[PDB]
Amino acid sequence: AVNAGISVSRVGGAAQTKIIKKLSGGIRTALAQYRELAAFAQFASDLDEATRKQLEHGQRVTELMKQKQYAPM
């Protein structure tokens, strides 16, 4: 249930290991932009490749962020 748009960390990349720091760069703001774009384009007749691609990626990352209790990675 983490709301990526309202949630924030003031230490940022300094609190991460080098591998996760490079791979997760910009994900938080990308999910926030996807929430606005997915609501704006909800009733659009057709969309450009940049918009179609952003929505397809946003849905996959939204699905990837789900996890079960007592199952740490």
């Binding site: 309202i6 940022g12 932009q33 704006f40 909800q42 009733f43 007749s45």
Partner: protein, 456 residues
């Protein structure tokens, strides 16, 4: 002659003195055998005075002897304060030993007279697109960064310190009022490592300190800035959270026997704020350029504290939680933010028209946004469809990566000049980029970076 502690309730302490030796209002008192100072707030009559402690009350007892110092809290001033860290009472909180002071000044003073007021309007370039476009600053003026929790006030102030104070030829003063101890330490090492510390005096009152400290640190920092202004110099004054001076007053107000006003604030809110704000000003002797971060409780700009603060500033920068929620930073609201310098006679007609043009497009898009969510983009007119695309591009072109924000963004910081800013917004308004995708303008810098990002 000495007095005795008669009552202790929270941070408020009552002391009884002989009827011929009662201390004056704002006079500093020292408790015998304990490292604590008291400031007199009221004379209750019958030789009793009410005071606030400038240290922890865990070691205090009733019946302890108290000494009158004969004057208000006095702090060291001048050249010896540069490159040092001090507490509310002016003691060094760094491990560099005693301060080489040559003069001490009381923290309480009257504001400059009406005849001493300045009138300068020299523009100050910040290197930040939104600010340079809709909120142009001026030398010797007052700036306020309004915003709720987590919207970017410290990050915006740190970028402004980098783009203004590092290149400045004069002295700077930073007052940490009710701030996080981590931010104070991070700023100290950054100024030290950057070799800029020799031009800055640092005064701190963290949020773990008694109400008396948080209520007076703003006066201690301002007292140091007044000494440099009165020497005929040009000074920079930074305050991380001016709201904490107001909040410390609210924590103690009811214990001082005062009835609460609207929203539970102290009845003296406007006067307490005015007595401090009228001293932070430029005069015929010298100038003080000040940037104050202003906290907005629960993002409500109508709350009595933010509402009373707007009238004291020349430039009002409003940071919006709704813009920050879209992942757009610096998150400055182009419609609520304003400056006294936004006049054709001060910035010329081309900049003024570009600024008003952006505001007109964004204001029109705000009333079309709700329609698209219900009926869709295709139900709009030919003019509305075109305008919505330009508004969404302008909204993204206002974003910019900061050097102090590389730890959050991962990408490198960008500095954008006023001419580059004006040219970019004029091009998007005139339709020179109608063919570029909406995503090309987000987090890029100058307008050529959007053209280059679109090809990637």
């Amino acid at each position: 002659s000495s007095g005795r502690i008669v009552q202790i309730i929270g941070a408020v302490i009552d002391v009884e003195f002989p009827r011929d030796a009662v201390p004056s209002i704002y006079e500093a008192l020292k408790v015998q055998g304990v490292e604590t100072t008291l400031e007199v707030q009221q004379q209750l009559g019958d030789g009793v005075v009410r005071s606030i402690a400038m240290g922890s009350t865990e070691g205090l007892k009733r019946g302890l002897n108290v000494d009158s110092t004969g004057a208000a809290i006095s702090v060291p001033v001048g050249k010896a304060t540069l490159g040092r860290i001090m507490d509310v009472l002016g003691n060094p909180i760094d491990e560099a030993g005693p301060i080489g002071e040559e003069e001490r000044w009381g923290i309480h003073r009257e504001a400059p007279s009406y005849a001493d007021q300045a009138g300068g309007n020299e523009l100050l370039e910040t290197g930040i697109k939104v600010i340079d476009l809709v909120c142009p600053f001026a030398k010797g003026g007052k700036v306020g960064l309004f915003g709720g929790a987590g919207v970017g006030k410290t990050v915006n102030m740190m970028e402004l310190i980098r783009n203004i104070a590092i290149e400045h030829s004069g002295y700077s003063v930073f007052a940490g009022v009710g701030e996080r101890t981590r931010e104070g330490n991070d700023f100290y090492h950054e100024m030290k490592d950057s070799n800029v510390l020799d031009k800055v005096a640092l005064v701190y009152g963290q949020m773990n300190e008694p109400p008396g400290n948080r209520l007076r640190v703003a006066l201690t920092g301002l007292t140091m800035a007044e000494k440099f202004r009165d020497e005929g110099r040009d000074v920079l004054l930074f305050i991380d959270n001016i709201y904490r001076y107001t909040l410390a007053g609210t924590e103690v107000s009811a214990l001082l026997g005062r009835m609460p006003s609207a929203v539970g604030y102290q009845p003296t809110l406007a006067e307490e704020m005015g007595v401090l704000q009228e001293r932070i000003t430029s005069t015929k002797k010298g100038s003080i350029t000040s940037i104050q971060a202003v906290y907005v409780p629960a993002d409500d700009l109508t709350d009595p504290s933010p509402a009373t603060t707007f009238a004291h500033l020349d430039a009002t920068v409003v940071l919006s939680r709704d813009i920050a929620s879209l992942g757009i930073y610096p998150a400055v609201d182009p419609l609520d933010s304003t400056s006294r310098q936004l006049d054709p006679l001060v910035i010329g007609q081309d900049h003024y028209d570009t600024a008003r043009g952006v505001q007109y497009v964004l204001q029109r898009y705000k009333e079309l946004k709700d329609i698209i969510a219900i009926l869709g983009m295709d139900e709009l007119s030919e003019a509305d469809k075109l305008l919505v695309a330009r508004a969404r591009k302008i909204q993204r072109f206002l974003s910019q990566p900061f050097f102090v924000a590389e730890v959050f963004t991962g990408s490198p910081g960008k500095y954008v000049s006023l001419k580059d800013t004006i040219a970019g917004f004029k091009g998007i308004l005139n339709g020179d980029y109608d063919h570029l995708p909406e995503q090309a303008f987000y987090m890029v810098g100058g307008i050529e970076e959007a053209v280059e990002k679109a090809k990637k």
